[PDB]
Design a binder for this molecule. Structure first.
Ligand SMILES: *C(=O)[C@@H]([C@@H]1N=C(C(=O)O)[C@H](S[C@@H]2CN[C@H](CNS(N)(=O)=O)C2)[C@@H]1C)[C@@H](C)O
Length: 249
């Protein structure tokens, strides 16, 4: 386990940040920054779409071809104001799609999947009575970076009781770009403000796959006072990419 504080500290300055990079298959910790913050559960926010995507594909309520029909009313981010696909749901963090999906899957099945996924505190209660559509959004559901790492491992290792295609479709939909050395970056951002505080939580997590197909999981996460502009995930992602490019995996 390489302590990457020298590289990661400056990137997370002004926040309580952390970074974990694990070998997917072996669970070898490859790089870590701030294990204390890594153990701290916080709301997954949009990174919950990783889990939801698995559920939605597994429950067969979506296919890659599914078009989520926008209700034609403003959703809060312009990119959300359009029809979406499971891919763009992920890419653009289209929460209304998530909310359609959770309503379709239903709380019972979500709870079952949370068990299957060993997903953090598995608390989907939300709140009123809004768990089904809000529980992952700076609400009841919490998961730590370390737990996210293990969840991610389970996904890419196909160590989840879901359809293989659910896993692969979800991973595919998380594809973002190649890193500098052509390592594949799959990831998902999440951001939110801490309940009752001005603090922001940010995540960027996912998978990297080397040119030779070697799989790693990583989580970049932070909580910090970043002001009124919700940029925590932007920072988490930029930091993850900086770190990942430095690690040259
Ligand atoms: C998920 O965590 C939430 C949504 N997911 C986001 C993402 O890109 O992953 C975003 S964070 C994005 C970055 N800066 C934007 C600021 N909001 S603004 N002023 O442009 O309206 C937001 C978003 C929070 C969740 C709501 O699904």
């Amino acid at each position: 386990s390489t302590d990457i504080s020298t590289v990661a500290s400056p990137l997370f300055e002004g926040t309580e940040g952390c970074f974990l990079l694990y070998d997917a298959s072996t669970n070898a910790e490859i790089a870590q920054f701030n294990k204390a913050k890594c153990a701290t559960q916080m709301a997954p926010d949009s990174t919950f779409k990783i889990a939801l995507s698995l559920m939605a594909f597994d429950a067969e309520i979506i296919d890659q071809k599914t078009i989520f029909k926008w209700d034609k009313t403003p959703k809060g981010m312009e990119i959300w104001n359009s029809n979406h696909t499971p891919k763009t749901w992920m890419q653009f963090s289209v929460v209304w799609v998530s909310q359609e999906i959770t309503q379709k899957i239903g709380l019972n099945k979500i709870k079952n999947y949370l068990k299957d996924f060993d997903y953090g505190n598995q608390d989907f209660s939300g709140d009123r009575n809004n768990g089904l559509t809000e529980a992952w959004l700076e609400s009841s559901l919490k998961i730590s970076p370390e737990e996210q790492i293990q969840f991610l491992r389970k996904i890419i290792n196909h160590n989840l009781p879901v359809k293989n295609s659910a896993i692969e479709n979800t991973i595919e939909n998380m594809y973002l770009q190649d890193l500098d050395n052509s390592t594949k970056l799959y990831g998902k951002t999440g951001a939110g403000f801490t309940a009752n505080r001005t603090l922001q939580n940010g995540w960027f997590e996912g998978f990297i796959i080397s040119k030779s197909g070697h799989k790693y999981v990583f989580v970049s996460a932070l909580t910090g006072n970043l002001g009124s502009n919700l940029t925590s995930s932007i920072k988490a992602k930029k930091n993850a990419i900086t770190i990942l490019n430095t690690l040259n995996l």
